Design an enzyme around this catalytic site. Sequence first.
Site, PDB file in Angstrom:
ATOM      1  N   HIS A  43       0.812  -1.213   0.000  1.00 21.60           N
ATOM      2  CA  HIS A  43       0.000   0.000   0.000  1.00 21.60           C
ATOM      3  C   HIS A  43       0.848   1.267   0.000  1.00 21.60           C
ATOM      4  CE1 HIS A  43       0.579   0.339   4.451  1.00 21.60           C
ATOM      5  NE2 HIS A  43       0.434   1.622   4.167  1.00 21.60           N
ATOM      6  N   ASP A  93      -0.157  -7.444   2.113  1.00 20.86           N
ATOM      7  CA  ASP A  93       0.384  -6.090   2.007  1.00 20.86           C
ATOM      8  C   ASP A  93       1.908  -6.165   1.935  1.00 20.86           C
ATOM      9  OD1 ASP A  93       0.542  -3.400   1.834  1.00 20.86           O
ATOM     10  OD2 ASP A  93      -0.035  -2.988   3.920  1.00 20.86           O
ATOM     11  N   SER A 191       4.541   2.815   7.946  1.00 23.35           N
ATOM     12  CA  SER A 191       4.117   1.740   7.060  1.00 23.35           C
ATOM     13  C   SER A 191       5.277   1.254   6.206  1.00 23.35           C
ATOM     14  CB  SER A 191       2.979   2.221   6.157  1.00 23.35           C
ATOM     15  OG  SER A 191       1.842   2.544   6.928  1.00 23.35           O
TER      16      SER A 191
END
Lengths: 245, 30, 17
Positions: A43, A93, A191
């Site tokens: 992502h 992910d 992230s």
Amino acid sequence: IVEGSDAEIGMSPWQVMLFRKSPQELLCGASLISDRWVLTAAHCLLYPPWDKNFTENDLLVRIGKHSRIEKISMLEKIYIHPRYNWRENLDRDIALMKLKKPVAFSDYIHPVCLPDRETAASLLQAGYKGRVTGWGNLKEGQPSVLQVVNLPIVERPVCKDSTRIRITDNMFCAGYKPDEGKRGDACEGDSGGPFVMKSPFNNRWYQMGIVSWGEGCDRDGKYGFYTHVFRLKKWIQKVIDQFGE
Amino acid sequence: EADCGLRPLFEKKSLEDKTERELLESYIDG
Amino acid sequence: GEPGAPIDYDEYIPGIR
Ligand SMILES: *[C@@H]1O[C@H](CO)[C@@H](O)[C@H](O)[C@H]1NC(C)=O
Ligand code: NA
């Protein structure tokens, strides 16, 4: 990173920062797994609901950084898991990024291990702590030094009960429970960075997770969710075997 | 690669960082 | 003591992060 501390020099020499090339902006964390391959969250590169679709020529990485010896590397190609599920829950992910040139290892640049089955079974247990590192926000600002926090893996029924999002086998969650007194979490900007654990069997650091998603940052009763690196290792090996150098 | 996970400034110098003991304790302690 | 996720291989507003 929320409720972390400043990293020691060379404490996380596999740390990678993912930048947008132009205009320059820090996008995500990432990790070095060989002299040509960098692991991050899908992502960070691809998220259609936000019209996000970065490819290799949009990006650069900074390796070996500690303060805001460090190498800027261009990307030859990026590879997003073909079953990455951005619509529902960020299942799978994970993404790989190939550097245009091999990065030289140093005291400040060194790759992390990927787990084998015995290591995964030994270490990926509820209550066992991993380490998360990043340049993300300190609350739900940016730091001057790479931040580090240690967080316990959480029992899956507790992870599931904490969110309305459907949890898959390709995720695990980590963080302190409300009654445990300690705090800490990843946050915006962390992230794609690694969740690592140190094997007592051979003294090596292993990347067990990728900072994937969460609800707010460091909220009581909420946990950070991490890509289950071991479960996706066959995809990692397939990409590296097919497109390696 | 063959040398992965051994940090030049810590494991390779027989030095521990300030909090890795916390991880080991979580793996051993009940 | 319990595994935090299955030890096997993948076979084939989402959060605030
Ligand atoms: C992302 O953009 C590239 C061109 O930069 C394009 O080739 C690719 O198909 C796009 N991916 C999408 C739309 O999912
Ligand atoms: Na929390």
